[model samples]
Target: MIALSQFNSLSKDEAAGLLAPCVALPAWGETLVSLRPFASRHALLQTAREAMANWGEDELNAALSAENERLAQALREGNARYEARFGRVFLIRAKGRSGEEILQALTRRLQHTADEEVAEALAQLREITMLRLEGAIGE
Candidate 1:
């Protein structure tokens, strides 16, 4: 993993390449790229959380659409229903989690109201970003 200082020194394209797999939204990657020279890993994570909170509907939809197709068929089908119910893609931090665990979380979150689900999704995105950032910086 690269250091935070190394990440700060990356060119826009280089940063975007590193960020692409971490985040589904291109704009989110661009946002982080533009906010170069992050003072600390915490600062980067905080900004990522804030950016996710302010993400537009279109951006969220685009991000959701970029989900990996390698997931189990059951998970894919469940996600379809999940999207239908929530009117958005299901987002979760899958690092260090089993497929079953992810499915369980999705099932549980399905009970939440639309607004609650949106908040939860954003929170999940933040967690994912934080984990990715940590990996990027070898923290």
Candidate 2:
């Protein structure tokens, strides 16, 4: 389990490599790598959250476009509806949740306006990033 200091000490590419699987957006990983030397793991996660919150439309779209077979298989009909309505893939943090729960969330989020859905999707991505970061470096 590498400490936050160890993670901070890694080169940009090394850090980005670790973060790449955490989120679909490559630019998000690059942004986090550039904002190194976090005071703590929590700080790193906070930075990740902030970065995701401020992500541009293109970056968010890129993240949405990334593949996830499990989600695709689980929410085929729901996802089709979601993407048809929102014009992008459905995004969620399915770390500890069941397929049913994810499906429920997808159904619920389908009701949100475009602006609201974007914000919610980014929030889910941030949650996923934090979990992956902890798994990567033992936060």
Candidate 3:
């Protein structure tokens, strides 16, 4: 398995390559590549969480758009309603969720306020980041 400590020693392209399959976002891969020489697993995950938190609506939508067609459609439609209601896309970790579940989540989240959605999105992002960190670090 690739060691997390080894990421710091890799080239930018190499780092991005390592992260690409795990995270579909180019920006996210680039961010991980730039934040090299990670001192510890915590630091790497912290940076990842921070990067995810800072990603804009468009970036989030771009990443989410690559999901299964049905899920993506649900996301697009949910994003439209969510933006109308909360001014942001409905963000969640869809790795294990079914299309129906995702659609339901999208519809339900559309009712949240901007603050509520932001908090929910951040929490989801944190979970995703932690999962990725565990994979990268063999945790």
Candidate 4:
């Protein structure tokens, strides 16, 4: 992991590369890049928080469409249902979650309405983004 001082001093490409593992969404990544020279890791995290906060239906709708994982047979059914209903792939942070746990979440998500699922997806993206940003910023 790279330190915050090191991250702040990186060339634009370098900084972006460090964050590359965070999201497939470059537009959002670019926003973080332009807000460079953050005072601390918290500032960096908070920057994204504000960015997500300012993000409304337009940003939320645009950014919501962003992961993949294999799973048990029930998960197969759950995934199919999720995709068929949402018409978009299912998303979860999946860092520490077990397959069945993910399956449970997926099954539960199957009941969520479109708007509700969008909010859930957005929240997952926010946490995933935060972790990756922190992962990029070493102590």
Candidate 5:
């Protein structure tokens, strides 16, 4: 197990090895290399936020590729339809959620007005980022 202190001391490779399997972004396993010697767990989390903030459409597509197959299909379809209607992915925090619930949310969100869906998707992105941050920083 990776202890907190050990995590603090690890080189980027060591830290990535310890964290990548437990987190969402394989690319982001290297984030600590750039940020280094985080003053607190919160600092690590802030880095995660920055990473998410900087993620582009291509990155989002790559992340979607790693999602559960059924979920990915659903998201792809939803994304296509949503973008046709609103021009973006229907992002949401899938952590702590049942697949059925996620499907339900997808179905419900489809009903939203384009403007409302855009707002909801952004909120969902924040929630997803926080979950990814928590996973990376060990709660």
Candidate 6:
């Protein structure tokens, strides 16, 4: 919804804020800034896509790592009850699943929070511990 020539005339600082919504990295903003004076609305968009399509892993990780930490916080809260029951650490025969699924398992076991949950936790502890035992002996 912007005129191409209008966009072309803005100062680089002005251009950078326009690009910020697409991606916030300064180098990315400058690359878009210097490309300069596109012919049409579509042409400006093409440049935006090209710049976004090619970028470093190092820059990408911070954004992903940020959202991933939120999931970490949710799981931490989910486990805190078992953490209370079992002491400093909680265990599950955990894996082969998404974090949401793992959290579901914790929530499931936590349904009772008592002898039942303790039994569930101890059962996981034994099953997991024995699997580890068998795995180390074989592998």
**Top-lDDT structure, candidate number:** 2
Candidate 1 lDDT tens digits, 85-110: 97776888887899889988987898
**Per-structure clash totals for the candidates:** 0, 0, 0, 0, 0, 0
Regions of candidate 4 where Cα sits further than 4 Å from its true position? 56-71
lDDT of candidate 4 over 41-128, digit per residue (tens): 8888888777666444455555555644556768888878888998777778899998878988998889998899988877887788
TM-score of each: 0.71, 0.77, 0.60, 0.83, 0.58, 0.43
What's model 6's TM-score?
Answer: 0.43
Give the candidate order by descending lDDT.
2, 1, 4, 3, 5, 6
Q: List runs of model 5 lying over 4 Å from the truth.
A: 22-27, 67-92, 98-101, 111-126, 136-139
For model 6, the run of ten residues with the poorest summed lDDT: 130-139
Off by over 4 Å in 1: 67-80, 87-89, 98-100
Tens-digit per-residue lDDT, 1-139, candidate 3 = 4777677788888788877765557887788788778877778777877777666555545655644786777777777877687654566787898778878887877777766776677577657756765676631
Q: What is residue 11's positional error in candidate 3, in angstroms?
A: 2.3
Candidate 2, 1-139: lDDT as tens digits: 5788888899988888888887788877888889888888888878877777777567677776746786668689899999899998888888789887988899899899989988888777678777877788745
Best by TM-score: 4
Candidate order by TM-score, highest to lowest?
Answer: 4, 2, 1, 3, 5, 6
Query: What C-alpha lDDT does candidate 6 achieve relative to the native structure?
Result: 0.59
lDDT of 5 by residue, 1-139 (tens): 4445667878777777766553356776676555767777777777766766655545555554545898868867876876677555567777788976877888888889865765666567556656654655542
Candidate with more favorable, higher lDDT: 1 or 5: 1
- Report the error of model 4 at residue 77, Å: 1.0
- Candidate 2 weakest ten by summed lDDT: 63-72
Which pairs clash inside model 1? none
RMSD of each: 4.6, 4.3, 5.4, 3.7, 5.7, 18.9
Would you list the C-alpha lDDT of every candidate in the order shown? 0.80, 0.81, 0.71, 0.78, 0.66, 0.59
Q: State which candidate, 5 or 6, has the greater lDDT.
A: 5
